[PDB]
Amino acid sequence: MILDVDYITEEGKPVIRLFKKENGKFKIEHDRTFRPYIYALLRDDSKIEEVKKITGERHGKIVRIVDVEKVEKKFLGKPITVWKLYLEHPQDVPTIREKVREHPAVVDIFEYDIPFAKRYLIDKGLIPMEGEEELKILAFDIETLYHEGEEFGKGPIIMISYADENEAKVITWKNIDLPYVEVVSSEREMIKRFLRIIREKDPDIIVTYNGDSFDFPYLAKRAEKLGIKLTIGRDGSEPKMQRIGDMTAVEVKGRIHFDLYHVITRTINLPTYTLEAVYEAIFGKPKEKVYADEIAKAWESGENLERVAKYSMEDAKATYELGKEFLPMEIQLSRLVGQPLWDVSRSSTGNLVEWFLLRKAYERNEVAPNKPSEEEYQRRLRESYTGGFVKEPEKGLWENIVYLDFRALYPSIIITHNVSPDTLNLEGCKNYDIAPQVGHKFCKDIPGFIPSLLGHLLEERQKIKTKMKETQDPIEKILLDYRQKAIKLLANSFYGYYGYAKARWYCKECAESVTAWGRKYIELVWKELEEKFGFKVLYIDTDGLYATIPGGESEEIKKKALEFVKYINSKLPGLLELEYEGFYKRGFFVTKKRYAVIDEEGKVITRGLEIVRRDWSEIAKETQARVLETILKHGDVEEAVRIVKEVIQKLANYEIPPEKLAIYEQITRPLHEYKAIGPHVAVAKKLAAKGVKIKPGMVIGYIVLRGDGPISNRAILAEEYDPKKHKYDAEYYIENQVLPAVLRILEGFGYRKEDLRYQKTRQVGLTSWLNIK
């Protein structure tokens, strides 16, 4: 099983190496026979003579086109005759590229910016992570004293935790009596032990969570300051920096450094991406966090280091669990396109698609288009681009709502309407499919390059789903659930690739067409859903529609909704298909992208309403939830308002516990750098005078008080607050806390702040106590 690929140089000759794990044994294969090459389209395939003589220089010698051969590949489907100009070394290519495309003999050149190791996998037909070799996974995390406004690498690395298939340890240089803590002599020794563990564990994949920017780099700094060689690579080499995308990653020559951050962050949205939050939002299980202030104190005054150590073994156990979690998919994905896990785990879906096409381009005899030129790329970034269709929602509260959505909408459209660059507006085709508004033409005679591949990807997926629900090997029934998910991810990525600025097979027309057709089928479904089955469409967004038969019975709706589906799928063309996706007892749609629904299991689903960020006190969070469940579970905005008013009142009559008033926030940096001085930032420097921690990494809880100046100068630590001595600013918690949280939901029903504010007495008119009035 191929783990990764690279090449060293010997005698000025490339020596591609293959890092394999065949039968528990790490093996390195060398191949001094592959050769760099570019393609040249000669207008006169005879000028190849004075053209194969050009030469350049990079580090002395004069690079010579060590060969040429007239090959017959094809371009965008049409025939073409180019020349394969071999070179002795990869580096020689940038040299002669600048030239070769100068001599009027060439019309243009192709496949010239493709990395040697990558060109190898493709051409050699090799696909990574192919096979079923047991890979050794090892996760690791580091804890340091580093903060923010300080030198990166200056503060020592306090601990180094790691975990695997069966073990979770912590290495530190201060005593802690715990079966899982390995006490050691010094920081240097900690690093030594760590280097030893990987030597003994010998992992194929080293998992980290943001190890690319934090762990490894920080580790490097320390190793250096302490004069130690970081022999992590299976060849004794050190972790190396490697530019990828627009960032700087880290690799380990003989192993695969898998950094979860890139993978996670791009497959799940979240307010922030702390290890804690992620572990929580993936397993539900919570994970306690320990902060700067704590850690520094425990390390200084050697007391309490037990919990600061558990946090550490916790970090590793987490990173490992997440790794096993996300590794299966990324691996199958790496298998899917033909590139190394290291690369894939850090790539965008667009670059993931590009890689796929490049090898699918070579499998067929298709020459690849080039990346846009710097100016092309620029005026492309400037060009507007299409997005998901969204229907202004119908207002009010609705019951018995069904959600219908298209299955693989864009991929389906790309396939059934043969939307591809090579089929766009060809002439003399027996048949065409025409994009709804933009009127683009697509030849239906021969399957387009992309549509062909996408069609096969989807057929191959059903295959999976079939051989899946069948077999009785749960482990397999799992591995292939992954293989089908990887295909799902990859296919859903083609739509956006079409508009990916740096894409070779870029085609703005295809993009617009897919969108217009999306609109057409959405509107068609919408049309017949209301005009024939008597439904009322409540909200549409990109793929799905929400609907209901106003006033109708719950079972009638479920029955007819399903009747409509089978009915419309008969009329929909090609692979276009709608499905009865879900049902909701009740729900409401505020604005585009902002709504709330609830299933029969009582499970609430919401978008753009619920307040998250710690920026909100529990009184705000709690009430909003009271409001949301009363309306969704019982259907009455009226009892919801009643609730809000009662809470607003309690806030005013100082009847709410200080805890449901505390707002927490961490100090991002020194309190001398803060421009905008919020409450905590002020409770920070306020305690700073009182001489205390104030280390950029700790959270300051606060409570605003009934002062006179701005909030800031009036907040007391969430503890320096004591009743019968403190009067919190109820107005603040009412006007800037509870009302905003609750009005996102009640505003739509017609409610206003005036309607929810409180006041013991209200001025009344005299006129009713008057008679001739």
Partner 1 sequence: PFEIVFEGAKEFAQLIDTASKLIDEAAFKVTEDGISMRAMDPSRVVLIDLNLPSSIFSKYEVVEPETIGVNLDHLKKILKRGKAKDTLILKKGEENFLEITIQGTATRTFRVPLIDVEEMEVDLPELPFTAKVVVLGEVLKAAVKAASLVSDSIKFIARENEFIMKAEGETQEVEIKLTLEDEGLLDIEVQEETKSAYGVSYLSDMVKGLGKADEVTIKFGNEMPMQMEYYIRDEGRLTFLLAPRVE
Q: Rg of the chain's alpha carbons, rounded to an integer?
A: 32
Minimum CB distance to partner 1 smaller for 274 or for 713? 713
Burial label for 442, CB within 10 Å (0-12, 13-18, 19+), is buried
Determine the interface stretch with partner 1 among 451-459, 485-493, 537-545, 764-772 (rule: CB under 8 A): 764-772
* CB of residue 725 to partner 1, shortest distance in Å: 12
> For partner 1, which stretch binds (CB under 8 A), given 73-81, 126-134, 268-276, 762-770?
762-770
Among 269, 373, 384, 771, binds partner 1 (CB under 8 A): 771
Give yes or no for residue 763 binding partner 1 (CB under 8 A). yes
Rounded Cα distance between 385 and 327, Å, is 33
- Asked if 761 touches partner 1 (CB under 8 A), the answer is yes
Smallest separation, CB 686 to partner 1 (Å): 21
Residue 766 is a binding residue for partner 1 (CB under 8 A): yes
Of 253, 479, 266, 248, give the one whose Cα is nearest residue 352: 266
CA 517 to chain CA centroid, nearest Å? 27
Distance CA 523, CA 457 (A): 28
In the list 62, 676, 689, 772, the residue contacting partner 1 (rule: CB under 8 A) is 772
708, 718 contact by CB (below 8 A): no
Least distance CB 772 / partner 1 (angstroms)? 5
What's the full length of the chain, in residues?
773
Give yes or no for residue 286 binding partner 1 (CB under 8 A): no
Near partner 1 by CB under 8 A: residue from 84, 727, 732, 745: 727
Cβ atoms < 10 Å from Cβ of 731? 14
Site for partner 1 in 494-533 (CB under 8 A): none
Using rule CB under 8 A, residue 773 touches partner 1: yes
Instruction: Please tell me whether residue 384 binds partner 1 under the rule CB under 8 A.
Output: no
| Site membership for partner 1, residue 430 (CB under 8 A) | no
78 or 760, CB closer to partner 1?
760
Residues that bind partner 1 (rule: CB under 8 A) add up to a total of 17
Closest distance to partner 1 from the beta carbon of 583 (Å)? 47
What's the closest the beta carbon of residue 735 comes to partner 1, in angstroms?
A: 13
Strand order in the sheet with 167-172: 181-183, 167-172, 159-164, 137-143, 205-208, 256-259
Residues 305 to 364 in contact with partner 1, rule: CB under 8 A = none
Q: Which stretch binds partner 1 (CB under 8 A): 303-311, 346-354, 371-379, 723-731?
A: 723-731
Minimal distance, residue 714 CB to partner 1, in Å: 12
Supply the minimum distance, in Å, between the C-beta of residue 707 and partner 1: 9
Residue 764 touching partner 1 (CB under 8 A): yes
The residue assigned the tokens 């029955």 is 559
* Other residues' Cβ atoms within 10 Å of the Cβ of residue 533: 16
In angstroms, the CA 21 to CA 28 distance is 9
**Closer residue to partner 1 (CB): 428 or 765:** 765
- 646 belongs to the binding site for partner 1 (CB under 8 A): no
760 binds partner 1 (CB under 8 A): yes
Alpha-carbon distance of 420 to 661, in angstroms, equals 57
Q: Does 762 bind partner 1 (CB under 8 A)?
A: yes
Q: Rank residues 689 and 770 by Cβ distance to partner 1 and give the closer one.
A: 770
Residue number, 111 or 729, with CB nearest to partner 1:
729
Candidate list 115, 706, 719, 747; residue touching partner 1; CB under 8 A: 706
Q: Which amino acid is at 769?
A: W
Position 379 contacts partner 1 (CB under 8 A): no
Smallest distance from partner 1 to CB 770, Å: 5
Which helix (H) or strand (E) segment is 620 a member of? helix 618-629
Q: Does 475 bind partner 1 (CB under 8 A)?
A: no
Write a three-state SS string for 201-269. Answer: HCCCEEEECCHHHHHHHHHHHHHHHCCCCCCCCCCCCCCEEEEECCEEEEEECCEEEEEHHHHHHCCCC
* Residue number, 554 or 713, with CB nearest to partner 1: 713
**Residue 767 Cβ vs partner 1, minimum distance, rounded to whole Å:** 5
The count of other CB atoms within 10 Å of the CB of residue 474 is: 8
8 Å CB contact between 508 and 383: yes
Binding letters toward partner 1, positions 729-758, x by CB under 8 A: -xx---------------------------
- DSSP secondary structure string for all residues of 128-184: TT-S---PPEEEEEEE-S--SSS-TTTS---EEEEEETTEEEEEESS----TTEEE-
Our CB check for partner 1 shows the closer of 570 and 763 to be 763
Between 62 and 772, name the residue whose CB sits nearer to partner 1. Answer: 772
Binding span for partner 1 by CB under 8 A among 367-375, 584-592, 747-755, 765-773: 765-773
Closest approach of partner 1 to the CB of residue 713, in Å: 16
Is 722 near partner 1 (CB under 8 A)?
A: no
Q: Could you say which DSSP state residue 660 is in?
A: G
570 binds partner 1 (CB under 8 A): no
DSSP state letters, 426-475: -SS-S-EEE-TTT--EEE-SS--HHHHHHHHHHHHHHHHHHHHHH---TT
Tell me the one-letter amino acid at 531: E
CB-based contacts of 549, cutoff 8 Å, min separation 6: 400, 533, 534, 535, 536, 556, 557, 560
Residue 767 binds partner 1, judged by CB under 8 A: yes
Beta bridge partners of 117: none
Examine residue 669 and tell whether it contacts partner 1 (CB under 8 A). Answer: no
Q: How many CA atoms lie within 13 A of 119 on its CB side?
A: 17
Over the window 590 to 619, marking each residue x when it contacts partner 1 by CB under 8 A and - when it does not, the resulting string is: ------------------------------
Considering the complex, state which of residue 104 and residue 765 has its C-beta at the smaller distance from partner 1: 765
Q: Using CB under 8 A, list all residues that contact partner 1.
A: 706, 727, 730-731, 760-767, 769-773
